[PDB]
Amino acid sequence: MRECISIHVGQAGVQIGNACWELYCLEHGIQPDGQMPSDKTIGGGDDSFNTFFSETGAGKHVPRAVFVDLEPTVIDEVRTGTYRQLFHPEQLITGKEDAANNYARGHYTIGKEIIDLVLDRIRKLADQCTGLQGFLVFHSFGGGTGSGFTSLLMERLSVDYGKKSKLEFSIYPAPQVSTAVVEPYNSILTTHTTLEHSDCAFMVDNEAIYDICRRNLDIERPTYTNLNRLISQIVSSITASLRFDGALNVDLTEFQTNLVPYPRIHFPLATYAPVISAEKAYHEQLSVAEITNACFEPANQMVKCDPRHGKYMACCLLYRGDVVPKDVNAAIATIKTKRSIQFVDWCPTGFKVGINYQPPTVVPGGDLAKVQRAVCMLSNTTAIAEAWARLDHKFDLMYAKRAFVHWYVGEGMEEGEFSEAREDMAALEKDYEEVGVDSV
Template identity: 35%
Template sequence: MSSAFHIHIGGAGVMMGDMLWKLYDKEHNETTQKNYIYDQVDENYHPLALFADLDDRMIYEVQRNKQIKFKKHSFVYGKEDSSNVYSRGRYTVGKYLIDQGLDFIRKQVETMDRLDQFLITASISGGTGSGFSSQLIDSLRYDYGIKVKQNGFILFPSSQMSNNVLEIYNSIFSIYMTLEHFDSIIMFDNQSIYNVIDQQLDLDYVDYSHLNNVIAQIISSYTGLRRFNNINNSKLFQNICPYPDLHYIIPSYGKMSLINDYTRKKQNQTEFIKYLTQKEIKLYQCPKNPKHLSTTLLFRQKEENNFYGKFDLTLQNLEHFYQQNPLVFQCTSSNYQILPELAEMKQTGIFFSNDASISNRFNLLGKQWDQLYAKRAFGWVYIREGLEECEFQEGRDILKSLEKDYSGIIDASDSSNQNNFNDEL
C-alpha cells in the first residue's frame, strides 16, 4: 500500500502542519485508508511527518498536543532562527540540520510499503521556508528520484501586504526550487486568503489560525481522495499541468459559514459551481481575469454523486486554451472543522486552476526585485551568510524565463484568435 509523507518547514509551514494534523485527527475514525498518512504500531497511529524549523518556538507549540502521537523522529529544530534571510536558512544555520532532517525522513519512510509522494507546506517569504526548504527539497529529489512526487502547498508574498522587507529576495531565490524540484505548486498568499475569509464570514477578528485552516482544508480534501475513496490522487495535479514547468496552480475554496449563522442553506449544483469559479475567491489573486490552461473541481460531500458537475454549463463554458473540459473529483467524506466558530458544512469545494494570467504576478514580483536590487538594498545581508553575487542575477533570470513561458501561452492564443477572426472576415 502506498503512503504520503508530509513535511512542514519554517514557522508558517509548521503552523499549517499543526492545523492539518488536528484536522486529520478529527477525520480519523471516518478514514478508510488510515495507513496512507499514518504508521500503525499495535493500536496506535503515528503521523508520517517531519516538522522542521531552525528554532524551537513553533515546534514546541505542535508538541504540546499530546492527543496526536507524533514519533520522536517527527521533529527537527535548532536554537537559532534564520532572521528571515534565505542564505542563512540554506548555507549557514540551516546546513547543520539538513543531514538530521534527511535521516529522520529516511527512518520513517522505511516503515512504508511504498512512498507515493512528499507533501510540503512552507512560506517562501521567510528565511527557513525559502533557504532550508531549497536545500532539503533538492536533497530529497536526489535521494528519492522523480518517481516520488513532490507537491508543495506554498505561501508566496502578497501583492500589497507585507511584514518582511526581505521577502522579495527570499521568494525569488526560491523560484528555482519550485520550478525544478516540485511536480506541482499550490499557491497562496495571506492577503488573498484573508479577503476570501472576510467575504464569506462576518468575523470581528481574523488571525493566522483562520488562514491556516483554509490551507489545511484544501490539503485534507486532496489527500482525502486516497484516504476516503482510495483514488490515486496524484493524477489530480498530473492532469492539471500540461507542461512540466507550468505547474503553478491557484485554488479557490468555499463555502465557509459561522456556527451561529442560521441563514445558511445548501446551494444547488449550479449556484455552488458558479461561486467556486468566480475570480474573487481565488486564494492567490492575479490582477487580470483567469486564462485557464486546465482546471479541476474537487468537491467534498458525504453522499456520493457520480454525475456532479459533469454536465454543468458553468464548467463547460470556462475558457480554456486547449478546449479541455474540467475534471471533476469527489471526496466522499464529511466536512470537519477545527475552529469552534466555524460550521461543518454539508458540502465544500475546491476549484484548482492552472492559470496563465499568473504571469502578471510573476511580473510584479520581478519589478519589486528590480527596485530593491538596483540599489543593492540588503544584498550584503545575503552575501555575509554565504550567498554568491551571481545568484542574484540567476534567480532573476529564472523568474523572467518562467514569466515568459506563461506569457507565451497567452500571446500564442491571442495570435490564434486574431487569425481566426481575420479568416472569418
C-alpha cells in the first residue's frame, strides 16, 4: 500500500476538497468523527482506503490532506463544520491577507512567507507514509492563491519530492461563476509555471459544471455547493482506483502511463454520465450502451470542446455499478461505427476499462439521484486545446494594452514573465496542433 497526499489550495481547492472528503467518507463508511466500524484492523492496516486515510490508536481515520489558504474564512468553515473532527489543526493552514486575485501576490509577496510552514506540515504527513506515491493538488486557475501559491508549492514539491507523481485538479475560469477580470492572467501565469511540475492535470471548466447543473439537475442558479458536489463525484470516480481494490490506475504513475505519452500534453478530458436530478421522481435507468455513448456528447464533458475535430492519444473508461465487460465491449463496437473517434496513428485505437461494482454514492439530500451505473471517461484528446485558445485569446486582449499589469509588477513580478508565460502557451497550442491536425 502506497499513500497519496491531497493538497487543497485557495477557496476553490478547499471547498472542492471539502466536498471530496465528505464523499470519500460516505463511500468508505467513515463517520464524521473518523470512526469506521467496518475497519477491523484498529489503529492500523494497509487496506486500499489507507492510501487516503491514516488511523489513530483510538480508531480515527484521518484524511492525508493539507488545506492551505492565504485568508482564514474558508478554512474556518472546515474547522467548525460537520467534518471538523476529521482533520487535526496542524493540517489546516491559513494566513491573514489573501492574494487579492493577484497571482503575483500569492506567488511572491504572500507565498514567500507561508511556503515553509506548508512544506513543514506536508512533511509531517509524508513522514507517516511507508511509501508515499505523491500528491493530488486541487486549486482554481483564476484565484490569486489557487494560481500563485499553487505554482510556488508545485516547484517546491519537485525539489523536496523529486521522484513523486503530482496530479492536479484545476478549476478553469468561467464568467458564469464569480470570475474576476484578471483570471485569464492568473490562469496563464500558473499554467506556465506549473507545466513542467505536473504529471497529469484534470481541468474542470466551471462553465461546463454550471451548465450540467442547470440542464440535468434543474438548478436555475447553481451555488458552489451544487457545483462542488458534482465535481467531487467526478473526482471520486477518478480516484476510486487508488482507494479501492482493482487493477487499473492503481498508482499515480499509472495515470501518466495510461493517459500522457507526450509530457507537456498532460490534460485529459473528463466526461461523466449519467447526471440525474434527485427531484426527478420517476426516472428510467440508463443502460451501459447509453451511459457509454453519453461519454461522446460535449454536453457531459468537464470542458466544452469538440472531440470529433481532434485526435485521441489514450482513452480510459471508469465505470461504477452494475456493469459487466460484455456490455462494455458491445457498447464500444456500436459507438465506434457511429461516432468520429480518430486516434493519432502512433497510438493504438483502444480503451482501458475499469469497473468498480459499488454504484456511485451520493450525499444524502444532495441534488444527484442514485443511479445503478455510471461511467467517467478520461480521454487525452487534442480538442481540449480549444480551452487554451479561448484563455490565451482573453489574455491577449488585455495584455495588448497592458491592462491590470501594474498590479502584478507592483508585487515584484517582472512584465517579462507575462510574455514568457504567453510564449509557453503559444508553444503548447502548437504542440496540440502538430499532434492532432492533418495538414492535408
